[PDB]
Amino acid sequence: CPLCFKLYAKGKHEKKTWFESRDFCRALGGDLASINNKEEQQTIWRLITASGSYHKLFWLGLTYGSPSEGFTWSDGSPVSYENWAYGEPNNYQNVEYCGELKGDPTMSWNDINCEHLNNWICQI
Ligand SMILES: CO[C@H]1O[C@H](CO)[C@@H](O)[C@H](O)[C@H]1NC(C)=O
C-alpha cells in the first residue's frame, strides 16, 4: 500500500451522499470500502484511532441489491462477513438502502438513506 483503506473525514460542509462518495472513490481507481473479514475491520479501526476520528460516521460500500440478495458491496462482492448494529438493517421508514459505519470500537453498521451526508472510506 502507498489491503489499503483511506479515511475521508470532512468538515460539515464537505460531506457527501453515498453516490457522491462512491464516485469519488471510483475516480481514484478504487471504490467505497468493503469490510470482508475481521482483519479488514481491525485495519480500519486502527486508521480511526490514528486520526482522532472517534465516534464519526462513514459511508461504506454497502448498498441494497434486489429484494432477494439484501445488501451487497459496491465493488461486486457479496456481504458474507457482517457487523450490523443490533436491530439493523431495520430499513427505518422504508427509505434506507445504503450502509454506514459507526466509527467507534464496536465498528457496527447501520442502513440509512443514501442521500444522507456522511464522511466516507475508500479502498484502493
Ligand atoms: C437515529 O437512528 C434511527 O434513525 C436512523 C435514520 O436517521 C436509522 O437508520 C436508525 O436505524 C434509527 N435507529 C432506530 C433504533 O430505529
Ligand SMILES: [Ca+2]
Ligand atoms: Ca437503520
